[PDB]
Amino acid sequence: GMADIDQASKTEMEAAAFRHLLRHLDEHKDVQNIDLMIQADFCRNCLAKWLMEAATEQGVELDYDGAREYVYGMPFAEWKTLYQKPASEAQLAAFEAK
Amino acid sequence: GMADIDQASKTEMEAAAFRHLLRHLDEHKDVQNIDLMIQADFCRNCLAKWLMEAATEQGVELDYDGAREYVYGMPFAEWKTLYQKPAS
Ligand SMILES: [Ca+2]
Ligand SMILES: [Ca+2]
Ligand SMILES: [Cl-]
Ligand SMILES: [Cl-]
Ligand SMILES: [Cl-]
Numbered sequence: 001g002m003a004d005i006d007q008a009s010k011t012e013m014e015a016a017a018f019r020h021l022l023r024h025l026d027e028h029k030d031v032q033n034i035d036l037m038i039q040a041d042f043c044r045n046c047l048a049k050w051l052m053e054a055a056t057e058q059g060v061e062l063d064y065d066g067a068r069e070y071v072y073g074m075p076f077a078e079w080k081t082l083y084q085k086p087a088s089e090a091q092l093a094a095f096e097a098k
Numbered sequence: 099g100m101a102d103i104d105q106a107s108k109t110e111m112e113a114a115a116f117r118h119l120l121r122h123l124d125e126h127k128d129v130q131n132i133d134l135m136i137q138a139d140f141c142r143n144c145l146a147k148w149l150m151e152a153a154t155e156q157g158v159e160l161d162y163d164g165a166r167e168y169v170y171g172m173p174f175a176e177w178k179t180l181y182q183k184p185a186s
Contacts, residue, residue: 001160001164001167001168002160002164002165002167002168005153005158005160006158009153009156009157009158010113011109011110011113012109012113012152012155012156013149013152013153013155013156013158013160014112014113014114014116014117014149014152015109015110015112015113015116016148016151016152016155016156017116017145017148017149017152018112018113018115018116018119019112020148020151020152021116021119021140021145021148024139024140024144025138028138028139031137031138031139035137035138036137036138038137039129039133039134039136039137039138040123040126040129040133040134040137040138041122041126041129042119042122046122047115047119050114050115050118050119051100051111051112051115053114053118054110054111054112054114054115054118055103055107055111057110057111057114058103058107058110058111058114059107060103060104060107060111061103062099062100062103062111065099066099066100067100069099069100070099070100
């Protein structure tokens with residue numbers, strides 16, 4: 001199991017799995033952040049925030065724009081223009097519900 | 099940005115963010131795998147499969163039950179009996 005694997009390999013595997021998640025989300029641009037928030041309490045923006053937190057743990061610098069640019073594969077502003085639809089009344093309500 | 103960070107730190111950050119997502123999902127055991135499949139096209143089993151694929155990349159064995167035990171924080175059988183509900 002995981003307990004049996006050397007730390008360096010485990011870190012590489014967890015890193016690889018994270019990058020896989022980024023590709024998956026990039027391949028499903030129809031999957032909206034507000035729906036991720038409603039269903040699962042996280043979205044692409046949270047992954048960017050979590051990277052910034054990890055940057056602090058590693059003594060390195062990453063700001064939110066840089067983190068988002070990495071997560072989205074381009075500047076957030078461009079992603080928003082090209083791909084994002086604003087929330088529906090039902091999504092706002094359902095977000096307000098949770 | 100991310101391209102400016104040394105490779106070892108960047109790897110550590112990606113791994114940390116993956117472990118954060120695991121803790122997040124463990125904190126939301128209410129969030130069923132079906133809803134994740136519906137809304138996001140992946141679920142906890144997917145994360146475990148991706149970890150299996152990453153193990154192969156690293157020249158180590160991690161089988162599916164091993165991967166799921168890690169992702170879920172306990173054997174999947176036990177998780178299914180305690181947390182999984184039939185789909186409405
Ligand atoms: Ca990407
Ligand atoms: Ca866990
Ligand atoms: Cl979105
Ligand atoms: Cl957003
Ligand atoms: Cl489930």
